[PDB]
């Protein structure tokens, strides 16, 4: 069983120098990793997986999971991103810091799309849960079990969508077709982060650094 109400509960329970945006990005990502763990524990059945598989899933998905969350958090921001530090990153600032291209993609492919369809917190939580239960993650002791949990999530989301937005038969599909963009944006953000590491912008010894070097 995978009640969509538990997933919303998990969401609600946790949620000008050129140098400011990168500093704030690193501080924000590290901060939200600690919160992400508490979120994942609130997702039905995640805590019942073997520890090693729970580790594999969070290491495979934390980046897209955090990007989904700040993108949805930014719906209210005018042409910008609201970081968990509280910094509003806007376009000129993003470009002066070297993250201009990804800024533009996040706004056009995630934030604006989340806003135009009025993606609600239950839909966001179910998408994140789908990301979390990623059966493609390498090294799972039992991908079939993780795939089964994924399947329960999107069955529940689909039925949620059909009973809350009866007039929008394509809504469930539309939600899922935002995952490919989340995948390539995650890859680009991760490339930035490995570059920030290379050049010494990332603070050391953090939980973020553990994700980058595990």
């Amino acid at each position: 069983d995978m009640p969509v109400e538990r997933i919303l509960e998990a969401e609600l329970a946790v949620e000008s120098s050129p140098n400011d945006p990168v500093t704030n990005i690193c501080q924000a990502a590290d901060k939200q990793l600690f919160t992400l763990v508490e979120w994942a524990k609130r997702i039905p059945h995640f805590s019942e997986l073997p520890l090693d598989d729970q580790v594999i899933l969070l290491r495979a998905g934390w980046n897209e999971l955090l990007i989904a969350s700040f993108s949805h958090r930014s719906i209210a921001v005018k042409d910008g991103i609201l970081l968990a530090t509280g910094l509003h990153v806007h376009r000129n600032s993003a470009h002066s810091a070297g993250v201009g291209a990804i800024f533009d993609r996040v706004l056009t492919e995630l934030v604006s799309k989340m806003r135009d369809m009025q993606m609600d917190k239950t839909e966001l939580g179910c998408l994140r849960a789908i990301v979390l239960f990623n059966p493609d993650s390498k090294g799972l002791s039992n991908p079939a079990e993780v795939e089964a949990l994924r399947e329960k999530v999107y069955a529940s989301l689909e039925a949620y969508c059909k009973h809350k937005y009866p007039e929008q038969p394509g809504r469930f599909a539309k939600l899922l077709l935002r995952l490919p963009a989340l995948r390539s944006i995650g890859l680009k953000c991760l490339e930035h982060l490995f570059f920030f590491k290379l050049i010494g912008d990332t603070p050391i010894d953090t939980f973020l650094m553990e994700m980058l070097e595990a």
Binding site: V37, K41, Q54
Partner: peptide, 10 residues
């Protein structure tokens, strides 16, 4: 070590 995640999952 790289067990920050492991200890938080407990």
């Amino acid at each position: 070590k790289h067990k920050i995640l492991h200890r938080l999952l407990q």
